[PDB]
Amino acid sequence: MAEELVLERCDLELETNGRDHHTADLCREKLVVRRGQPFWLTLHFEGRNYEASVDSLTFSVVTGPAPSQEAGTKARFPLRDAVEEGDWTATVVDQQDCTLSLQLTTPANAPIGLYRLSLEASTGYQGSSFVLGHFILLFNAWCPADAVYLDSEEERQEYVLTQQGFIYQGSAKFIKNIPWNFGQFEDGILDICLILLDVNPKFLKNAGRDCSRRSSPVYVGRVVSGMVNCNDDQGVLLGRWDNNYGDGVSPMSWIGSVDILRRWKNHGCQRVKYGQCWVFAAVACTVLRCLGIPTRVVTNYNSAHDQNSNLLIEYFRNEFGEIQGDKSEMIWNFHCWVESWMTRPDLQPGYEGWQALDPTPQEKSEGTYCCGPVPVRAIKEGDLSTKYDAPFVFAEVNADVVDWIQQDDGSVHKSINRSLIVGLKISTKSVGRDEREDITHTYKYPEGSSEEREAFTRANHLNTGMAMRIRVGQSMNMGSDFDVFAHITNNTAEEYVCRLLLCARTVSYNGILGPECGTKYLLNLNLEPFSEKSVPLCILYEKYRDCLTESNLIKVRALLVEPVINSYLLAERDLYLENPEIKIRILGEPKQKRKLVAEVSLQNPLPVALEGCTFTVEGAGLTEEQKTVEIPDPVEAGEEVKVRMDLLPLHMGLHKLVVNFESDKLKAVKGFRNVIIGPAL
Ligand SMILES: Nc1nc2c(ncn2[C@@H]2O[C@H](COP(=O)(O)OP(=O)(O)OP(=O)(O)O)[C@@H](O)[C@H]2O)c(=O)[nH]1
C-alpha cells in the first residue's frame, strides 16, 4: 500500500533557465523560455521521493482560452527515462533526497504565449492533480529547428537581445542616427505584448484559431504590424502629420518604445497620441524582439511611399519648378519599416531570411493597410508575385520619377533631373557596433547591371551638356543663417543666357512642403563656355523658424532654363539643420545596484531665449523609469542648460542612455551615451 505523492513546492529554476534560454532579464516573477529547447524543473516532495515502480506522472500544458491538442495549444505527455518521440517531453535528469530534477522540452514550432503547466500524479489507483505554475514560451533564434533560427550569435544578440539602437533620419546627403530605447525586456513589456496579441482582431474573431496560429513568425509579425497603427479602436499609436502635436507627445519627442506601450496599456489600450512611421517601426521592433523574432528597423531615403505601388510617378510643375498637383503624393525624404528573420514555408523554397514589414498604413486597392511580410530577396529579384505586398515594397525602392514643366501652349516639357533617385542609402544599425550598415544592396542590384535588367523584366518594370546640383558649403546648424548654392556646369563650347529659379522651403520628413524660406530669381544668367557658376541662396533663421518641423529639413529647388533649345534642368536637395550637441557626463563608478549620476547639458544655438526647457532620460538597464527634469528659468541666447539626473542601474553590461531635450523654440534634441555597468561586488 503506497502513500500518495505530495508536492511541497515546485521550483521553475528561473536563474538557470533564464541564463540558458537568454531570457534572464525577462525572468522576474514568472518563467520565460524559448521553444525547441529543454528547461529545468525541480519538484519537491514531503515524506517520499518519486517511485518509478509505484508512481505515475503525466504533465499537461495549455495556452489558449480554448486549448486543443489538434490546434497545438494543449499537450499531455508522461514522465520518462530517456527523451521520447514526441513534441512535448518530460524526463528525469536527477533524483536526490525528496527532490526530482526534470527537463521539459517543447516543440520548435510550439505556439508562443503564456502556458499553464499541470501535473497529474497517480499513485496506486488514487489520482491527484496540481498546477505547478505558468511559463511564457517565445520564439527561439538559438534553436536550429525553429523557423527564426540565426546561425550567428552576434546577430542573435543584436536582433533579439539588444535593447537600444539607432533609427536613421535626416537626409540621404546627411544621414542622422537617432538613439532609441527599444526596452523589450523592461518591466511589464512582455505582458503588454501578450495583451497586444490577445486584443488583436483575429483573436476577437476566433481566439482558439489565433492562439494556434501563433506558432508562425509570419502570423505573429503580421498581427503585430497591424496592431501598431492600422488597427482602429485597439491600435497602439495614432498618427498625426500636420505639425500640431500640442495635445499629445510629438512623434519626434519619443526616445523609446517603452513609454508608448505603457501609456497604451495603462489607458485601456487607447491609441497613444502621435507617432509617425519610424515610431511605428520602433514599437513593432520592440514587440517582435520581446517575442523572440529577430527584427531590425530599416530606413529608406527618397522613399516612394503611398503611391499605390505606381512605378512611374509624374509631377507637373510651373515656370518656377513648383509642383502644381494638389492630387499628387510627394516622395518621402525617408520612410521606415522593419525586417524580421524567418523561414517562409508558405512560399516557394529559397525565400527564407529577412522579411520586410511596413507597419505604416498605405493606400491600396481595397483600402489603407500595412504591407505584410515580403522576402527582401524577392523584392531584389523583382519577383512581385511573392506573397504579402511585394509590389508596394518594390515601388518603395524602385519607382521612377518624371518631372514636367508646363508650357504656355498647355503642353509639358520633360526636364532633366539627376539629383533624385528613389531608394537611397537604405540603412540599419550594424551588428554589435554603433556604426551604420548600408543594406541597399540587399534590396536592389547595381544599376545598369545584368541582374538589374533581369529583375526588372520579371517585375515588368523596364523604364544639353549642362548639369546642375545643389551644394552646401559645410554643415549648417539649426538657429543660424547659412548659404546654399546652385552649381551649374557648362562643359560645352556654347555660351548660354538662362533662367535660374531658386526656392527654399521648409518641408516635413514625409514631403509636405511649407512656405518658402528663401528665393532668388535670375532671368538673364550668363553661363560661359567650358565653365562653372555658383549662385548663392541665403537661408535665414528668421525665415525658416516659424514653419520648420522637428525633422529640421529644408528643401532647396533649382530650375535652370535654356530658352534657345527650351531645355529644363532640375536640381533638388534636402538639408538637415544640425541640432546642438547634448553633452553627457557620467559621475561615480558605474556599478550594478549603485547610484549613478548623469549630467546633461547643451548650449542654446538660437538668437532668442529658450523657455520650458526639459530634459528626459531613458535607458533599459540604467533606469527603471523614465526621468524628467524641468528648468524653471529661461535659457538666454548664449547660455548653457545643465542638469543632473540620478540613476540606479539594475543590470550589468553595456546599456545606452538616451536623452531628449524639449523647449518652446528648440524641440526634440537628441543625445546618447554608452554606459557599461560593472559587477556590484
Ligand atoms: N548639417 C548638414 N551638413 C551637411 C548637409 N549636407 C552636407 N553636409 C556637410 O557639409 C559638407 C558638404 O558635403 P557635401 O554636401 O557632400 O558636398 P557639397 O558641399 O554639397 O558639394 P559637392 O560635394 O560638390 O556636392 C560635408 O561636411 C557634409 O558632411 C546637410 O544637409 N546638413
Numbering used by the authors: 1 to 463, 471 to 688
Question: What does the publication say?
Answer:
Transglutaminase 2 (TG2) is a multi-functional protein that possesses various biological activities, including protein cross-linking activity, GTPase activity, protein disulfide isomerase activity, kinase activity, and scaffold activity. Human TG2 is 687 amino acids in length, consisting of four domains, an N-terminal β-sandwich domain, catalytic domain, and two C-terminal β-barrel domains, and is the most ubiquitous isoform of the TG family. When it is secreted into the extracellular environment, TG2 functions as a cross-linking enzyme in the matrix. This protein transamidase activity of TG2 is positively regulated by calcium and negatively regulated by GTP. Structural studies showed that TG2 undergoes an extraordinarily large conformational change upon activation; closed inactive form and opened active form.
Human exon sequencing data in the various sequence databases, including NCBI, Ensembl, and ESP, showed a valine residue at position 224 of TG2, supporting the idea that the G224V form, rather than the G224 form, is the natural TG2 variant. The 2.5 Å crystal structure of TG2 (G224V) was solved and refined to an Rwork of 23.6% and an Rfree of 25.6%. There were three monomers in the asymmetric unit, chain A, chain B, and chain C. All three chains were identical and contained GTP, which is similar to that of the recently solved GTP-bound form of TG2 (G224). The root mean square deviations (RMSD) between the TG2 (G224) and TG2 (G224V) variants was 0.51 Å, indicating that replacement of G224 with valine did not have any effect on the overall structure of TG2. The G224 site on the structure was carefully analyzed and we found that the amino acid residue at site 224 is a critical residue for the formation of hydrophobic clusters with neighboring hydrophobic residues, including V287 and L288, which are located on active site cysteine (C277)-containing ɑ-helix in the catalytic core. The active site cysteine (C277)-containing ɑ-helix, which is stabilized by the formation of a hydrophobic cluster with neighboring V224, was shifted to the opposite direction by 16°, especially the active site cysteine region. Moreover, TG2 (G224V) was approximately 4.4-fold more sensitive to Ca2+ than TG2 (G224), with Ca2+ EC50 values of 0.211±0.038 mM and 0.929±0.06 mM, respectively. Stability analysis of the two forms showed that TG2 gains stability by mutating glycine to valine at position 224. Based on these results, we conclude that hydrophobic patch formation, via the newly introduced G224V, may lead to fixation between G224-containing α-helix, which is connected to the Ca2+-binding site loop, and active site cysteine (C277)-containing α-helix.
